[PDB]
Amino acid sequence: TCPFYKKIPGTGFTVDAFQYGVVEGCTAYFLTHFHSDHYAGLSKHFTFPVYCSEITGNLLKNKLHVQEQYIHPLPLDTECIVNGVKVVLLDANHCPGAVMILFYLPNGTVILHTGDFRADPSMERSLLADQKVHMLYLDTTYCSPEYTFPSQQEVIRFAINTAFEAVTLNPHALVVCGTYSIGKEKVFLAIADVLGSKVGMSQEKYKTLQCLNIPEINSLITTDMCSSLVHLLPMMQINFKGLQSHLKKCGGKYNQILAFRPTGWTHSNKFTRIADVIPQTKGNISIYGIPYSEHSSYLEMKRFVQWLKPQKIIPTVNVGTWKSRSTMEKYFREWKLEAGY
Ligand code: NI
């Protein structure tokens, strides 16, 4: 059965609620983004209206085979009426096609559901600036002050320079990048661009990337592995065993692998600056773990909430333990007292 924090009161609506069968009273099912914990349940047999972005719609249709008659794409930054209620979709600065949803309830209440987001000061000049928000359903993934990490821009700079240096010293090195879902595409795109190569990958991954409306994509990616010196592999294969094995397959073209594992936060963030990061190395293989986050840091989250000044906050992440819930409510009360709302 569907938990309370995925229901929108006073509407027939749910958010990211596909794993509970037919939800009683639900006339429209919203999907914030194409990540498996959120779409869990959807398939070609689904027969209720799905509301989402254009990109999320391309993924539903081509990867999960949802029939076209049930996919309702909405443009961003545009007031839309759905089953008699005004809604707006806002870019969430998460993965491609990820949105936040503003609902304008018939009784005058205004609700913002962030889905998964990486809060940015540029959100303070969207359609959020115009008006008041009574309830916030918040992505609280990293709602604790230990969670620090650099900007996405600093992380990409480190990856581009690392890769360019290696391959310039050794033109026979191959670069490999791990992936398990959409998001974080800039890692492998930025590296391929500095090296003047396409990104090589499996047919299934190429399919997924073709659904994302990335400009000039046919110029950037390929299924011909042999022509490419940046390859993508599943994240599970980014280890000394998996990579030795991949190197065997390349037919005596390369004599070194440099690989990148984009992760979220890891404890080595509590001591080490991005500039000071070093790989794990076995022979002619080196692996860099790099902290490329598509979720708010603690400071980014705090700044957004202090700016928005919501009357009530409902977390959507880390809700399963008493200690987590208690920790989150303490931070929300500090933020409110410090800022005066
Ligand atoms: Ni996500």
Ligand 1 centre from 94 Cα, in Å? 7
Distance from C-alpha of 232 to C-alpha of 238, rounded to nearest angstrom:
10
Ligand 1 centre from 115 Cα, in Å? 8
The full set of domain ranges for the chain reads 1-147+296-341, 148-295
Domain 1-147+296-341 has CATH 3.40.50.2300: no
Ligand 1 centre from 316 Cα, in Å? 12
Ligand 1 centre from 32 Cα, in Å? 9
CB contact at 8 A, 60 and 212: no
How many C-beta atoms lie closer than 10 Å to residue 166's C-beta?
18
Ligand 1 centre from 245 Cα, in Å? 30
Distance from C-alpha of 48 to C-alpha of 30, rounded to nearest angstrom:
11
Compute φ and ψ for 298, nearest 5 degrees.
Answer: -55, -45
Q: Which residues on adjacent β-strands are paired with residue 13?
A: 8, 28
Ligand 1 centre from 35 Cα, in Å? 5
Distance from C-alpha of 114 to C-alpha of 79, rounded to nearest angstrom:
17
How many C-beta atoms lie closer than 10 Å to residue 82's C-beta?
18
Distance from C-alpha of 297 to C-alpha of 205, rounded to nearest angstrom:
29
CB-based contacts of 220: which residues, under 8 Å, 6+ apart? 189, 192, 193, 198, 199, 214
Tokens of 145: 């002050």
Compute φ and ψ for 215, nearest 5 degrees.
Answer: -55, 140
Distance from C-alpha of 66 to C-alpha of 210, rounded to nearest angstrom:
17
Tokens of 299: 């400071």
Using CA atoms, how far residue 60 sits from 6, 186, 199, in Å, is 20, 22, 24
Ligand 1 centre from 261 Cα, in Å? 17
CATH code of the domain made up of 148-295: 3.40.50.12650
CA-angle at 332, arms to 328 and 334, nearest 5° = 115
Compute the residue count for the chain.
Answer: 341
The coordinates were experimentally obtained by X-ray
Q: What is the 3-state secondary structure (H, E, C) of the chain?
A: CCCHHHEECCCCEEECCCCCCCCCCCCEEECCCCCHHHHCCCCCCCCCCEEECHHHHHHHHHHCCCCHHHEEECCCCCCEEECCEEEEEEECCCCCCCEEEEEECCCCCEEEECCCCCCCHHHHHCCCCCCCCCEEEECCCCCCCCCCCCCHHHHHHHHHHHHHHHHHHCCCEEEEEEECCCCCHHHHHHHHHHCCCCEECCHHHHHHHHCCCCCCHHHCEECCHHHCCEEEEEHHHCCHHHHHHHHHHCCCCCCEEEEEEEECCCHHHCCCCHHHCCCEEECCEEEEEEECCCCCCHHHHHHHHHHHCCCEEEECCCCCCHHHHHHHHHHHHHHHHHHCC
User: Are β-strands 85-91 and 80-82 bridged in parallel, bridged antiparallel, or unpaired?
Assistant: antiparallel
Tokens of 87: 């809604």
CB contact at 8 A, 49 and 80: no
